[PDB]
Amino acid sequence: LYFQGAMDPEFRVINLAYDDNGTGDPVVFIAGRGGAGRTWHPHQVPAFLAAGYRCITFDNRGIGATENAEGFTTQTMVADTAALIETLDIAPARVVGVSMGAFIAQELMVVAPELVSSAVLMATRGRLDRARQFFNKAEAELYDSGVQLPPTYDARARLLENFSRKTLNDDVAVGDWIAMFSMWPIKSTPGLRCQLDCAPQTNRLPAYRNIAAPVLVIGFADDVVTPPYLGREVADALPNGRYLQIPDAGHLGFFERPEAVNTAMLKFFASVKA
Amino acid sequence: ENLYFQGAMDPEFRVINLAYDDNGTGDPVVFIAGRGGAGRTWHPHQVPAFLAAGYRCITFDNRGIGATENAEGFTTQTMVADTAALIETLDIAPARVVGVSMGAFIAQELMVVAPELVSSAVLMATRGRLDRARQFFNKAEAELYDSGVQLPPTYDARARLLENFSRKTLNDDVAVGDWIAMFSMWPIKSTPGLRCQLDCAPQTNRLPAYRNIAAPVLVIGFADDVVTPPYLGREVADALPNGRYLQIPDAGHLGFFERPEAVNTAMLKFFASVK
Secondary structure (H helix, E strand, O other), rough: EEEEOOOOOOOOOEEEEEEEEEEEEEEEEEEOOOOOOOHHHHOOOOHHHHOEEEEEEEEEOOOOOHOOOOOOHHHHHHHHHHHHHHHOOOOOEEEEEOOOHHHHHHHHHHHHHHEEEEEEEOOOOOOOHHHHHHHHHHHHHHHOOOOOOOOOHHHHHHHHHHHOOOHHOOOHHHHHHHHHHHHHOOOOOOHHHOOOOOOOOOOOHHOOOOOOOOOEEEEEOOOOOHHHHHHHHEEEEEEOOOEEEEOOOOOHHHHOOHHHHHHHHHHHHHOOOO | EEEEOOOOOOOOOOOEEEEEEOOOEEEEEEEEEEOOOOHHHOOOOOOHHHHHOEEEEEEEOOOOHHHHOOOOOHHHHHHHHHHHHHHHHHHOOOEEEEEEHHHHHHHHHHHHHOOOHHHEEEEEEHHHHHHHHHHHHHHHHHHHHHHHOOHHHHHHHHHHHHHOOHHHOOOOHHHHHHHHHHHHHOOOOHHHHHHHHHHOOOOOOOOOOHHHHHOOEEEEEOOOOOOOOOOHHHHHHHHHHOOEEEEOOOOOOHHHHHOOHHHHHHHHHHHOOOO
């Protein structure tokens, strides 16, 4: 059903949809920017259920019912995630985050290590290098100037930024991904714009040196949005962090290479106590 | 110091002049820039190495660039004729040719209709057809221009960086800083010439036509190129009877600016041992 998220600087309460399937070890998935809880269902949830896990997915602040939410920060979203885990009384929970959701996971582990037993961080970073800082500032500038991209150009960008070269060279896969875009419309909302800022303002890597819990950081070879090498940095900082690269995976490697990413998550999760 | 030659007449029976450059006294080489490139783009890296190697370099402003940025409804065949006219006016047939991208497609089509004009060529970042992704990218680019919408400068620069450079380059804060700033000095102006240049591309599979080009050709693939991926260049080289394939690692679509020494060394090696 719904849980109550953190109160926002303007003293308003927020409810956030979540979905809870199966029984067993609890796993909380946090999606990236623009991802609803549904993002984990086509590829992750059925594998995690078959492996005996209980899967919690949910709709981040600024998505769906709260797509008009604004004036929020990383801390606000971390607090949200803490509320889910506490409300559901599942602490310590295994956590799976990707990109913005992986940042949240990280920053949650900094302030509330006891909410989290082990984590997989996909397509992540602890800081923005000069390219990613420029990209981030360019997306903000796009939204803020009101101009809407035409739909084919918008699908071109989505294709080029999120998929491996190997996918782009395969006319059949390309066709399918373009169709697949119609089914995942990404509305340009105040919530989407606000999630853009839920990203490293500073180098957060020192803080990660104190995270004790076991962590698998997954990097995607072909990712230009959150390049593998920033993933690696995060893993090095994590005392009990390990790193694994998926070959021929774009930024959306968890959809694109779901069998390889699931195998590696499950493997890692079975090697650590609940 | 202001050289122009007369190119193909357009369908309105107007004469078109196109600016060109010509330096050096050695073996002639004609460079054909890619979409949106002025001839001057060959100058920061290619020209000085060719001049120092004793070649004479010819560069020019393709139809739809600079003084003809407002020109439209021309085709590949029109530009192939411009290039033919250049080689003829200068009386350097048969010439060495270096093309990149749209320029490499031009060179390839030149070779098909007028093989006598070209002794050998280097074709960088090329293809003889559009696959599903590249076809879709092209449709999307046309849609963007045709809708009237103007991308904000930073967002456009983002796209340039993402379309053009290797991953090794994007991860290099200093290099990236230099490329972001280099876009100020080479802005890519949205013009009817640019929009028409978009269609000077392989409408069909052109690979069968290329099995008849006799001249020695080096095609250069750039490893990280998503605009024209390497495997499309390989295809060009396979179709060519005397074509050979080289691939530069860590090179985006703009490999020839990004790895000028690797690319130059390859082309000069090639040209030294051609007939």
